[PDB]
Design a protein around this ligand. Structure first.
Ligand SMILES: O=[N+]([O-])c1ccc(O)c2ncccc12
Length: 256
């Protein structure tokens, strides 16, 4: 209760479907946008006591943020994603071909270093256009459909601070240095052992726990459910491992 040994947002906010949700960024380096919108989704539902529960649109953020956020499918930055939500807001939008919400994701699901029936993920494709319109059959206007953030912030490189933030306000977006052995993750607690550095990856942190004395963070990847542990993974917590505790960002939904 002053930080229990383990915490899982799905259990704290059982009426919030998005927290339990794994998405797929497709052949696009949109991890920066998915960890952001995934957490925004979660916080919207947490902030409203599930009175409002929507899929925030990775599509809106990825196509419309623009240079502020980086280079679309060519990679981007978490801090600027949340800042963009506080100023321009984000509309709802679901999975590929879901017809859910205002602007569903337009990049098809693919296999991310795993065997499946979807085509393998090819590189970072092109970034779609920013079209401020909702799908036909979605009643409210894109403008009326925007959900703004009251604020955004970078949480310090502090384990306690990160736990307290998730505990009180919900899931966060974080980022870490990906080494080759992370691609191969299947289950258990991920700890870097072999491999070279492949740049960084953005994700959603939604909990923490302890596996046989090993503290870990509960994370959602954006590589579909057939990757890793049903799309989630665990990673060593408390050691700023692969920088897991250095790039944490979040913010509070704007009520109105
Ligand atoms: O599956 N992947 O390997 C992968 C990882 C991270 C990414 O940002 C990707 N983007 C596009 C395609 C594959 C990606």
């Amino acid at each position: 209760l002053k930080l229990p040994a383990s915490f899982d947002a799905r259990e704290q906010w059982p009426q919030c479907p998005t927290i339990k949700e794994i998405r797929d960024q497709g052949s696009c380096g949109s991890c920066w946008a998915f960890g952001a919108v995934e957490a925004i989704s979660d916080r919207i539902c947490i902030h409203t006591n599930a009175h409002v529960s929507v899929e925030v649109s990775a599509e809106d953020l990825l196509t419309c943020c623009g240079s502020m956020c980086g280079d679309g499918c060519n990679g981007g930055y978490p801090a600027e994603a949340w800042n963009f939500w506080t100023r321009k807001g984000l509309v709802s939008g679901g999975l590929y071909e879901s017809h859910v919400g205002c602007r569903p994701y337009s990049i098809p699901p693919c296999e991310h270093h795993v065997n499946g029936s979807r085509p393998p993920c090819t590189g970072e494709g092109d970034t779609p256009k920013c079209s401020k319109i909702c799908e036909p059959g979605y009643s409210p206007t894109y403008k009326q459909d925007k959900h703004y953030g009251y604020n955004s912030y970078s949480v310090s490189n502090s384990e306690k601070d990160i736990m307290a933030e998730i505990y009180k306000n919900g899931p966060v977006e974080g980022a870490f240095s990906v080494y080759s052995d992370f691609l191969l993750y299947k289950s258990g607690v991920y700890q870097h052992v072999t491999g070279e550095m492949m740049g960084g990856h953005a994700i959603r942190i939604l909990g923490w726990g302890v596996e046989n004395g090993t503290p870990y963070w509960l994370v959602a990847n954006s590589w579909n459910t057939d990757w890793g542990d049903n799309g989630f993974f665990k990673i060593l917590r408390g050691q700023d491992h692969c920088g897991i505790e250095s790039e944490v960002v979040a913010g509070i939904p704007r009520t109105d």
